[PDB]
Design a protein around this ligand. Structure first.
Ligand SMILES: [Mn+2]
Ligand SMILES: [Mn+2]
Length: 292
């Protein structure tokens, strides 16, 4: 039909052929990972009870509530179909026995710089891999695929995870229309958002500190150092603090860096940032870019 309709049917055909299917995602998983890898796993469990389907990898603790993962022998990979989602690079795949199956399938929305797999479906126009999986489902409908409540919730969590609940510019028509269909399943989006957005008191306090102390140059320049005492004063990791860099986004008139000792993260509202050089788009403090 649509060169696309053909590609998706080929993945569906291949999935129907193999009795054992093992699914992976990228290390340091995020909602999209859990949405796609596990969204598909759930679709295949419901559609094909007679097969042996497994999702492998190391759990992220804040994401567990979504789904729990399987631990699998080396022997189970023999003759198995392996599907890997949301991972641009083979060296970032979680659980490296990914190419020891009979076949390997790449499903991804990042650029195809590492074109791995026997079968590949890689669209950079998708908002997320979870969205790609809903699409794959739609085509699988004709072929007897079933979406249950669990799977709906997974895919929906992955789409809101990669778009910042329809905030970022990777949101498309398809993203929103698909979201529409998903929320007709009876999972609580409210419970879901509460779980996704839940933040430990100590991190909140930290954010606070940051907000209280941010300063702005007349050219919209802003900077945040989270020195030594600070990370201990608040009892927060490097990982927890660095992850607050995107909380300054709405300050009126901001055009900032971020930082943090273990690290540099940078963000803009205009002036590209793939510039400031120190091997997406206080010496570094040449930032006031904002000048021009
Ligand atoms: Mn991801
Ligand atoms: Mn993704």
């Amino acid at each position: 039909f649509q060169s696309m309709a053909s590609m998706k049917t080929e993945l569906i055909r291949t999935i129907s052929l193999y009795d054992t299917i093992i699914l992976h995602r990228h290390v340091r998983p995020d909602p999209d990972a859990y949405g796609s890898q596990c969204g598909l796993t759930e679709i295949l469990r419901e559609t094909y009870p007679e097969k042996n389907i497994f999702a492998v990898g190391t759990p992220e603790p804040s994401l567990s509530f979504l789904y729990s993962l399987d631990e699998v022998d080396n022997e189970t990979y023999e003759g198995a179909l392996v599907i890997v989602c949301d991972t641009a690079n083979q060296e970032r795949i979680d659980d490296q026995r990914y190419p020891s199956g009979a076949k390997l399938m790449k499903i991804d929305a990042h650029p195809n710089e590492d074109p791995y797999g026997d079968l590949l479906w890689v669209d950079t126009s998708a908002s997320s891999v979870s969205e790609m999986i809903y699409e794959l489902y739609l085509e699988g409908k004709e072929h007897g695929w079933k979406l249950n409540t669990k799977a709906a919730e997974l895919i929906y969590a992955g789409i809101v995870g990669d778009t910042g609940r329809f905030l970022f510019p990777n949101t498309t028509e398809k993203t929103l229309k698909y979201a529409g269909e998903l929320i007709q399943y009876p999972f609580s989006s409210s419970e879901l958002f509460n779980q996704l957005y839940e933040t430990k008191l100590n991190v909140v306090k930290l954010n606070g500190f940051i907000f209280q102390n941010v300063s702005l140059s007349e050219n919209g320049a802003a900077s945040v150092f989270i020195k030594k005492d600070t990370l201990e004063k608040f009892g927060t990791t490097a990982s927890e603090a660095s992850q607050l860099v995107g909380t300054l986004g709405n300050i009126s008139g901001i055009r900032w860096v971020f930082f943090v000792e273990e690290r540099v993260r940078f963000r803009s509202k205009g002036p590209v940032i793939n510039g400031l050089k120190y091997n997406h788009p206080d010496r570094i403090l040449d930032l006031e870019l904002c000048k021009e």
